[PDB]
Design a protein around this motif. Structure first.
Motif, PDB file in Angstrom:
ATOM      1  N   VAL A  71      -1.821   0.224   6.414  1.00  0.00           N
ATOM      2  CA  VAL A  71      -1.406   0.532   7.786  1.00  0.00           C
ATOM      3  C   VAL A  71      -2.546   1.287   8.457  1.00  0.00           C
ATOM      4  O   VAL A  71      -2.934   2.363   7.988  1.00  0.00           O
ATOM      5  CB  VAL A  71      -0.121   1.375   7.847  1.00  0.00           C
ATOM      6  N   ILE A  85      11.514   2.076  15.454  1.00  0.00           N
ATOM      7  CA  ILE A  85      10.160   1.544  15.519  1.00  0.00           C
ATOM      8  C   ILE A  85      10.238   0.183  16.176  1.00  0.00           C
ATOM      9  O   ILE A  85      11.185  -0.573  15.938  1.00  0.00           O
ATOM     10  CB  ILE A  85       9.535   1.477  14.111  1.00  0.00           C
ATOM     11  N   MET A  89       1.524  -6.542  11.949  1.00  0.00           N
ATOM     12  CA  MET A  89       2.504  -6.106  12.927  1.00  0.00           C
ATOM     13  C   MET A  89       1.962  -4.882  13.653  1.00  0.00           C
ATOM     14  O   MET A  89       1.163  -4.124  13.095  1.00  0.00           O
ATOM     15  CB  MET A  89       3.825  -5.768  12.269  1.00  0.00           C
ATOM     16  N   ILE A  90       2.407  -4.682  14.898  1.00  0.00           N
ATOM     17  CA  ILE A  90       1.881  -3.625  15.754  1.00  0.00           C
ATOM     18  C   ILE A  90       3.014  -2.764  16.289  1.00  0.00           C
ATOM     19  O   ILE A  90       4.073  -3.281  16.655  1.00  0.00           O
ATOM     20  CB  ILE A  90       1.080  -4.199  16.932  1.00  0.00           C
ATOM     21  N   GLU A 149       3.505   1.330  18.600  1.00  0.00           N
ATOM     22  CA  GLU A 149       2.843   2.437  19.278  1.00  0.00           C
ATOM     23  C   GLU A 149       2.514   3.542  18.299  1.00  0.00           C
ATOM     24  O   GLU A 149       3.343   3.907  17.462  1.00  0.00           O
ATOM     25  CB  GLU A 149       3.733   3.034  20.358  1.00  0.00           C
ATOM     26  N   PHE A 181      23.024  -2.986  10.539  1.00  0.00           N
ATOM     27  CA  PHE A 181      21.841  -2.660   9.762  1.00  0.00           C
ATOM     28  C   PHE A 181      22.047  -1.281   9.135  1.00  0.00           C
ATOM     29  O   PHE A 181      21.945  -0.251   9.809  1.00  0.00           O
ATOM     30  CB  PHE A 181      20.620  -2.695  10.670  1.00  0.00           C
ATOM     31  N   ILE A 206      12.946   6.148  14.357  1.00  0.00           N
ATOM     32  CA  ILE A 206      13.240   5.973  12.940  1.00  0.00           C
ATOM     33  C   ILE A 206      12.390   4.841  12.383  1.00  0.00           C
ATOM     34  O   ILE A 206      12.247   3.783  13.014  1.00  0.00           O
ATOM     35  CB  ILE A 206      14.733   5.723  12.725  1.00  0.00           C
ATOM     36  N   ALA A 207      11.848   5.047  11.185  1.00  0.00           N
ATOM     37  CA  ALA A 207      10.979   4.072  10.542  1.00  0.00           C
ATOM     38  C   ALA A 207      11.496   3.895   9.117  1.00  0.00           C
ATOM     39  O   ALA A 207      12.651   4.218   8.809  1.00  0.00           O
ATOM     40  CB  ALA A 207       9.516   4.523  10.604  1.00  0.00           C
ATOM     41  N   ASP A 208      10.642   3.358   8.238  1.00  0.00           N
ATOM     42  CA  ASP A 208      11.008   3.100   6.848  1.00  0.00           C
ATOM     43  C   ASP A 208       9.787   2.823   5.976  1.00  0.00           C
ATOM     44  O   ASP A 208       9.438   1.661   5.739  1.00  0.00           O
ATOM     45  CB  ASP A 208      11.974   1.926   6.768  1.00  0.00           C
ATOM     46  N   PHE A 209       9.157   3.881   5.459  1.00  0.00           N
ATOM     47  CA  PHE A 209       7.897   3.743   4.734  1.00  0.00           C
ATOM     48  C   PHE A 209       8.054   3.097   3.372  1.00  0.00           C
ATOM     49  O   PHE A 209       7.070   2.580   2.825  1.00  0.00           O
ATOM     50  CB  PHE A 209       7.249   5.095   4.525  1.00  0.00           C
TER      51      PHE A 209
HETATM   52  O1  LIG Z   1      10.076   0.104  11.163  1.00  0.00           O
HETATM   53  C1  LIG Z   1      10.481  -0.353  10.094  1.00  0.00           C
HETATM   54  C2  LIG Z   1       9.530  -0.604   8.925  1.00  0.00           C
HETATM   55  N1  LIG Z   1       8.219  -0.199   9.367  1.00  0.00           N
HETATM   56  C3  LIG Z   1       7.730   1.110   9.190  1.00  0.00           C
HETATM   57  O2  LIG Z   1       8.430   1.963   8.673  1.00  0.00           O
HETATM   58  C4  LIG Z   1       6.303   1.170   9.745  1.00  0.00           C
HETATM   59  C5  LIG Z   1       5.289   1.148   8.554  1.00  0.00           C
HETATM   60  C6  LIG Z   1       5.288   2.470   7.742  1.00  0.00           C
HETATM   61  N2  LIG Z   1       4.988   3.555   8.682  1.00  0.00           N
HETATM   62  C7  LIG Z   1       3.626   3.729   8.996  1.00  0.00           C
HETATM   63  O3  LIG Z   1       2.793   3.108   8.379  1.00  0.00           O
HETATM   64  C8  LIG Z   1       3.209   4.660  10.070  1.00  0.00           C
HETATM   65  C9  LIG Z   1       2.917   6.000   9.680  1.00  0.00           C
HETATM   66  N3  LIG Z   1       2.485   6.979  10.500  1.00  0.00           N
HETATM   67  C10 LIG Z   1       2.336   6.580  11.807  1.00  0.00           C
HETATM   68  N4  LIG Z   1       1.913   7.323  12.891  1.00  0.00           N
HETATM   69  N5  LIG Z   1       1.916   6.558  14.040  1.00  0.00           N
HETATM   70  C11 LIG Z   1       2.332   5.327  13.721  1.00  0.00           C
HETATM   71  C12 LIG Z   1       2.617   5.256  12.310  1.00  0.00           C
HETATM   72  C13 LIG Z   1       3.068   4.265  11.402  1.00  0.00           C
HETATM   73  C14 LIG Z   1       6.014   3.652   9.791  1.00  0.00           C
HETATM   74  C15 LIG Z   1       6.109   2.360  10.647  1.00  0.00           C
HETATM   75  C16 LIG Z   1       6.233  -0.123  10.475  1.00  0.00           C
HETATM   76  C17 LIG Z   1       7.296  -0.956  10.089  1.00  0.00           C
HETATM   77  C18 LIG Z   1       7.372  -2.262  10.457  1.00  0.00           C
HETATM   78  C19 LIG Z   1       6.359  -2.785  11.268  1.00  0.00           C
HETATM   79  C20 LIG Z   1       5.330  -1.984  11.700  1.00  0.00           C
HETATM   80  F1  LIG Z   1       4.378  -2.496  12.499  1.00  0.00           F
HETATM   81  C21 LIG Z   1       5.273  -0.619  11.303  1.00  0.00           C
HETATM   82  F2  LIG Z   1       4.331   0.154  11.775  1.00  0.00           F
HETATM   83  N6  LIG Z   1      11.810  -0.682   9.881  1.00  0.00           N
HETATM   84  C22 LIG Z   1      12.794  -0.493  10.910  1.00  0.00           C
HETATM   85  C23 LIG Z   1      13.682   0.634  10.359  1.00  0.00           C
HETATM   86  F3  LIG Z   1      14.478   1.213  11.259  1.00  0.00           F
HETATM   87  F4  LIG Z   1      14.479   0.228   9.379  1.00  0.00           F
HETATM   88  F5  LIG Z   1      12.903   1.591   9.842  1.00  0.00           F
END
Ligand SMILES: O=C(CN1C(=O)C2(CCN(C(=O)c3cnc4[nH]ncc4c3)CC2)c2c1ccc(F)c2F)NCC(F)(F)F
Length: 271
Positions: free
Chosen positions: A25, A69, A83-84, A86, A126, A146-149
């Motif tokens: 990433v 995200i 994937m992209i 912000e 979801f 919310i994200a998902d590392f």
């Molecule tokens: O979003 C998702 C899964 N997913 C992600 O978690 C990530 C990759 C893992 N993460 C990163 O690497 C990161 C860390 N620090 C950061 N600082 N600033 C931007 C940024 C990013 C977070 C963002 C991401 C995902 C998918 C496509 C992406 F293009 C992307 F970036 N699932 C939805 C649900 F809600 F379930 F979480």
């Protein structure tokens, strides 16, 4: 459902944001300071890790809430796939809160933003399954997404444990029925949200159930499901006024039909 293809030539790699087992990433700067996050798939990926990436694209393209995200574009005309999103300039909520005190209005605001995200996801059915401050992203002016590392990150390896027949799971955030029975429902996400709110109001200075170790966290899961008084709860944060602590204890009631919905949690937090 579809997304746009972003000219890859205009991306300019700046920093590495993280690593999975099957991709990187990158924080880049777009030329036409504008920065994006790019989740890539390593060019040498097996059938399973490539098809899971395409499934990840299909699911991410449907997520349309300003606290989840959000997919800006992809690179899929040729490898590596991308994937992209912000850039969020304040990192994960665990890292950001640990750096600090911050206004209680800002903490409560960030908890409401999580609750709005979670109610969106609950409306898509979801189940997120790993909610935590480590999984939240923080941007300009105390905004949340919310994200998902995944469980890959080395920094949070201590938040995770593998049951003897089960996969690795963040047991300290999970409800008993996601542990003792493996049923991840939006109720289990609501118990997650209870622990996440607790981390927000403690500034994540320590891991929840810090007094315990893992096998005692599991025995304590048994004390929740036993519901005979021997369960121990997360203590009420000093910053946390009594009513939002009652929202938290409501997240942690033994039977799921008595836990709050994310829509009601969001309503309650806004007062
Ligand atoms: O979003 C998702 C899964 N997913 C992600 O978690 C990530 C990759 C893992 N993460 C990163 O690497 C990161 C860390 N620090 C950061 N600082 N600033 C931007 C940024 C990013 C977070 C963002 C991401 C995902 C998918 C496509 C992406 F293009 C992307 F970036 N699932 C939805 C649900 F809600 F379930 F979480």
């Amino acid at each position: 459902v579809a997304v746009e293809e972003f000219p890859r030539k205009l991306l300019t790699f700046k920093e590495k944001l993280g690593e999975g087992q099957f991709g990187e990433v990158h924080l880049c700067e777009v030329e036409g300071p504008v920065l994006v996050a790019v989740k890539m798939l390593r060019a040498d990926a097996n059938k399973n890790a490539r098809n899971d990436f395409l499934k990840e694209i299909k699911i991410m393209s449907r997520l349309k809430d300003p606290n989840i995200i959000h997919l800006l574009a992809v690179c899929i005309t040729d490898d590596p796939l991308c994937m992209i999103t912000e850039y969020m300039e304040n990192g994960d909520l665990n890292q950001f809160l640990s750096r600090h005190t911050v206004s209680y209005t800002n903490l409560k605001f960030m908890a409401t933003q999580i609750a709005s995200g979670m109610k969106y996801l609950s409306s898509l059915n979801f189940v997120h399954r790993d909610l935590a401050t480590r999984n939240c992203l923080v941007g300009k002016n105390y905004t949340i997404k919310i994200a998902d590392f995944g469980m890959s990150r080395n920094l949070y390896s201590g938040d995770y444990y593998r049951i003897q027949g089960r996969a690795v799971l963040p047991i300290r955030w999970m409800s008993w029925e996601s542990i003792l029975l493996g049923k991840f429902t939006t109720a289990s996400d609501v118990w997650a949200f209870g622990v996440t709110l607790w981390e927000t109001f403690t500034f994540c200075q320590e891991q929840p159930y810090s007094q315990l170790s893992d096998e005692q966290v599991i025995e304590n899961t048994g004390e929740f499901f036993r519901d005979q008084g021997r369960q121990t709860y997360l203590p009420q944060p000093a910053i946390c006024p009594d009513s939002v602590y009652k929202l938290m204890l409501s997240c942690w009631r033994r039977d799921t039909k008595n836990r709050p919905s994310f829509q009601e949690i969001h309503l309650l937090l806004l007062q």
